[PDB]
Ligand binder design. Structure first.
Ligand code: CHL
Ligand code: CHL
Ligand code: CHL
Ligand code: CHL
Ligand code: CLA
Ligand code: CLA
Ligand code: CLA
Ligand code: CLA
Ligand SMILES: CC1=C[C@H](O)CC(C)(C)[C@H]1/C=C/C(C)=C/C=C/C(C)=C/C=C/C=C(C)/C=C/C=C(C)/C=C/C1=C(C)C[C@H](O)CC1(C)C
Ligand SMILES: CC1=C[C@H](O)CC(C)(C)[C@H]1/C=C/C(C)=C/C=C/C(C)=C/C=C/C=C(C)/C=C/C=C(C)/C=C/C1=C(C)C[C@H](O)CC1(C)C
Lengths: 219, 219, 215
């Protein structure tokens, strides 16, 4: 289609002339952007693709889950810390982790139990992803299908490829946005949507340039 | 033959056949099939004339009350900037011949009688020269051009003998409306970043050009 | 034949040279066989690293010259309000604004947004022209356009061309190392490079780097 093939939209648009030979257009999200030469080998390129897709999916989940508590708090739902980068310290509070301020819900108190459960379950699922498990065997490391395609949206090749491209694009957007979350948390010290509100209030004054003069190395 | 910054396609669909044709389409919304084939190909030029036509009235109407009150032909009580004239009550509401919610209904009624007829000339040319409307339906038949009806009422003064005169006067009017659209957009945005009317902004700029430019205002 | 090329070229470890990578055959400028991480084994990645190195070297040369010249001029007497290289972006936020050479009749910029937008547009255009074509010629080599950017014809004779390539990569690697030094000194010492040099010259025994190792 438009995305797959020699004539595909490139990351530099009309300014792209040096298209890497190994980047031909047979994989999703192939804009021909490889200037560091870090995916020249076919095996290294496959490993990089796998890393990219896993990172993309995790970034999508993280972006949605970092701002969902923010939106719920803005509506009026009570939390312990709505902000994502202090949402993890409420396990140490006397009331535990309420999960939407509901003591009848998870109501966890021991971070050790959370850590152990996460280690066991994530190890299991990670290992299944690498080698196969209950939800089918491993054929494509990043496009298993079957038990992870219950709605069967990836039935014909054309829709499956277009959905590949759409997935990778939303995922790259999410990864960019999560890098933004991290940097903004580091510098501003306030939640993402709170920074959005500050920017909307006084865009000229409340912006990133306001914090340019905070890391001056006086010594 | 005169052209302006044009993309690759541009000339493919745009050509020197309609008034004001210059080929500028970065995004190419006028693509015949392309992306944008849902809108009728005759719609975009027609809408472009009309939005510009109203822009002439708006750009010549938002600034007349202030200037005419400064040189002096109108009492200063009613000489107010356009955004204090009732369009935005919470920024300003000046009492008028009637309350603004009745003026709106009188507006919508009169505009409707003048706008529905225009609509169905475009859809069905010459359809308003059939039914009796106070006897003035023979004039309101149109010349077949939705954008340029022509007639003893809408062309009462009658400029333009041959097609040579019209083919350039149309270019003039689309271009005089070109500035009018930008002028109103200036009125809007130049008003949001300020609190006071357009004319004095020109006077401030003419007073201290190195102190009241866009860069100095806010940031 | 150029002494800087071939298999008889000097090594990064000098007399202590041991194993040299096969792909490093000396056919390119500035080759000393320094690849212990195997980060340029593949020819394509090697070429990409070459363009990255040349661009980084040129940018570092510009950066070092622009970090030295303003503060040297300040030493001469041309006051700027904030002369140190890392204390140079805050000049815009000041009431006076960013004034070139400390004079109001120069650029006299005051809004960071305008500088950012103009620089974004212009740098995007020029960087696109760097890889694709553009007004200043088309693409002939990714990093050596040719006579379009060589108006004095220093590349006319191939041997002097190769010698100039070697000299360019040399001066540029020196500039990159100096720029890393600038960054580390600013982070650690917090003072300008010329003032650091003056402090070292004053009492080098005590006013050296080991003094600031106390954390
Ligand atoms: C014309 C045109 C131009 C100029 C660009 C430019 C760019 N595109 Mg691109 N595109 C263009 C057309 C199109 N793009 C795309 C689709 C994409 C995609 C999907 C992506 C890009 C990306 C990029 C970037 C690739 C280079 C890079 O790695 O960024 C590095 C260089 C910069 C970001 C420029 C420098 C920024 C700034 C001016 C300097 C920062 C100064 C700091 C204050 C200094 C920091 C201080 C201290 C702490 C160190 C670059 C910004 C990529 C991206 O980066 O996002 C990317 O993923 N484009 C399409 C649709 C097909 C186009 C048409
Ligand atoms: C003899 C001889 C020796 C011993 C060296 C040694 C070196 N040369 Mg070389 N050269 C020698 C002859 C010649 N050189 C060159 C031309 C060059 C060039 C162009 C370059 C070198 C470079 C190098 C370095 C590259 C190897 C490395 O991995 O460094 C990495 C290892 C170190 C730098 C070890 C430093 C030890 C130090 C005491 C540790 C510091 C301790 C800290 C306090 C701890 C930090 C704390 C925490 C926070 C992390 C190394 C220092 C390269 C360079 O690095 O510059 C380089 O670009 N040489 C010529 C001309 C033909 C020679 C004759
Ligand atoms: C590359 C690059 C590096 C290493 C730095 C590094 C720095 N900038 Mg800087 N900048 C860089 C590009 C740019 N900056 C700016 C605009 C600014 C501003 C407005 C400020 C900085 C400041 C700073 C310092 C914090 C730090 C030394 C801050 C500073 O100067 O602290 C004293 C500061 O206020 N930069 C623009 C536009 C850039 C375009 O490339
Ligand atoms: C128009 C145009 C302008 C204003 C510039 C301007 C610049 N080029 Mg550039 N270039 C332009 C077209 C082109 N360049 C290049 C290839 C390069 C290279 C390889 C390099 C530059 C570099 C530079 C910068 C320093 C010299 C400077 C900003 C240098 C730089 O700063 O990076 C540099 O190394 N240009 C090609 C091919 C072009 C085709 O039009
Ligand atoms: C990368 C994915 C990711 C991760 C690591 C987290 C992590 C967390 N979330 Mg978030 N979340 C995510 C995605 C994610 N979320 C998404 C996609 C949504 C949208 C549905 C949410 C919506 C959401 C809400 C509404 C809340 C959390 C809360 C929490 C915290 C308690 C764990 C929990 O939900 O109870 C365990 C949950 C279950 C056992 C349910 C089934 C699994 C924890 C910091 C809670 C919080 O604020 O605490 C800090 C909370 O109230 N999450
Ligand atoms: C609503 C007003 C309007 C409309 C309907 C059009 C419609 C058209 N213009 Mg015109 N144009 C306008 C305003 C408008 N223009 C203004 C203000 C300018 C000055 C910058 C121009 C300058 C201009 C040039 C120089 C050229 C055109 C051309 C065209 C044609 C092809 C592009 C197209 O479909 O645009 C469709 C436009 C829209 C759908 C409006 C976009 C609405 C977005 C959301 C606004 C975004 C800006 C916002 C303020 C932020 C088409 C008939 C080309 C031609 O030859 O046609 C005769 C051509 O060469 N336009
Ligand atoms: C890529 C390298 C580089 C970069 C990023 C800068 C960046 C800067 N320089 Mg430096 N500079 C450089 C190379 C560089 N310079 C070199 C090679 C020289 C020697 C010719 C200078 C000599 C120099 C002086 C003498 C001054 C600056 C100043 C400045 C600042 C404003 C200049 C400006 O944008 O006006 C653009 C101006 C024109 C286009 C004209 C800015 C932080 C000024 C400043 O405020 O520094 C404190 C200043 O006074 N620079
Ligand atoms: C060619 C590059 C170059 C040059 C000329 C200098 C020169 C100097 N540096 Mg800088 N520096 C450099 C690279 C360079 N350094 C790099 C790459 C780093 C990062 C590791 C540093 C980190 C650094 C710190 C943290 C400090 C200096 C200091 C000094 C002063 C000498 C006392 C000490 O040295 C230290 C030298 C090194 C740490 C490494 C350079 C090794 C040289 C180039 C090779 C051997 C000769 C002197 C002005 C000190 C000073 O006087 O500041 C007031 C000081 O505090 N430099
Ligand atoms: C392409 C290319 C090419 C050439 O060759 C070279 C170069 C240029 C280098 C390259 C580039 C690259 C890049 C750009 C990258 C990026 C990345 C990213 C951004 C990632 C993210 C990534 C991201 C991610 C993972 C994310 C994740 C997320 C998560 C987990 C989350 C979590 C969480 C949350 C929810 C919140 C809560 O409360 C808690 C927590 C727990 C905190
Ligand atoms: C070889 C090898 C081999 C094996 O295999 C491995 C290993 C060992 C790892 C390797 C090594 C490597 C290395 C050493 C590297 C280095 C680098 C550098 C130093 C860079 C710089 C680099 C540098 C650079 C870019 C620079 C740049 C600069 C700039 C921009 C500047 C800017 C500026 C200035 C002027 C100042 C003012 O006021 C402002 C501003 C605006 C801020």
């Amino acid at each position: 289609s438009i995305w797959y093939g020699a004539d595909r939209p490139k990351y530099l648009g009309p300014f792209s002339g040096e298209t890497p030979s190994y980047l031909t257009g047979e994989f999703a999200g192939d804009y021909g952007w490889d200037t560091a030469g870090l995916s020249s080998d076919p095996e290294t390129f496959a490993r990089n693709r796998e890393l990219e897709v896993i990172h993309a999916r995790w970034a999508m989940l993280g972006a949605l889950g970092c701002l969902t508590p923010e939106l719920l708090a803005k509506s009026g739902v009570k939390f312990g810390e709505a902000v994502w980068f202090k949402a993890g310290a409420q396990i140490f509070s006397e009331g535990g982790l309420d999960y939407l301020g509901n003591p009848s819900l998870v109501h966890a108190q021991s971070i050790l139990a959370i850590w152990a459960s996460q280690v066991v379950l994530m190890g299991a699922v990670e290992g299944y992803r690498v080698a196969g498990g209950p939800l089918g065997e491993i054929t494509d490391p990043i496009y298993p299908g079957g038990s992870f395609d219950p709605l069967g949206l990836a039935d014909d090749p054309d829709t499956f490829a277009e959905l590949k491209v759409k997935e990778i694009k939303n995922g790259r957007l999410a990864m960019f946005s999560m890098f933004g979350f991290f940097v903004q948390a580091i510098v501003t010290g306030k939640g993402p949507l709170e920074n959005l509100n500050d920017h909307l209030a006084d865009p000229v004054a409340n912006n990133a340039w306001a914090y340019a003069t905070n890391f001056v190395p006086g010594n | 033959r005169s052209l302006i910054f044009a993309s690759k396609q541009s000339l493919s669909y745009l050509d020197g056949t309609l008034p004001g044709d210059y080929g500028f389409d970065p995004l190419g919304l006028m693509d015949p099939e392309g992306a944008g084939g849902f809108i009728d190909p005759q719609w975009l030029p027609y809408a472009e004339i009309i939005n510009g036509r109203f822009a002439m009235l708006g750009a010549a109407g938002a600034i007349a009350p202030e200037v005419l009150g400064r040189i002096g032909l109108i009492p200063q009580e009613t000489a107010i900037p356009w955004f204090q004239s009732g369009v935005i009550p919470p920024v300003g509401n000046y009492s008028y011949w009637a309350d603004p919610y009745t003026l709106f209904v009188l507006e919508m009624a009169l505009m409707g009688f003048a706008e529905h007829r225009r609509a169905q000339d475009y859809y069905k040319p010459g359809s308003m020269g059939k039914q009796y409307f106070l006897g003035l339906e023979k004039f309101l038949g149109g010349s077949g051009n939705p954008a340029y009806p022509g007639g003893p009422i809408f062309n009462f003064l009658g400029f333009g003998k041959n097609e040579k005169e019209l083919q350039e006067l149309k270019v003039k009017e689309v271009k005089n409306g070109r500035l009018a659209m930008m002028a109103v957009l200036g009125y809007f945005t130049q008003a949001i970043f300020t609190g006071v009317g357009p004319f004095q902004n020109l006077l401030d700029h003419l007073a201290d050009p190195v102190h009241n430019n866009v860069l100095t205002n806010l940031k």
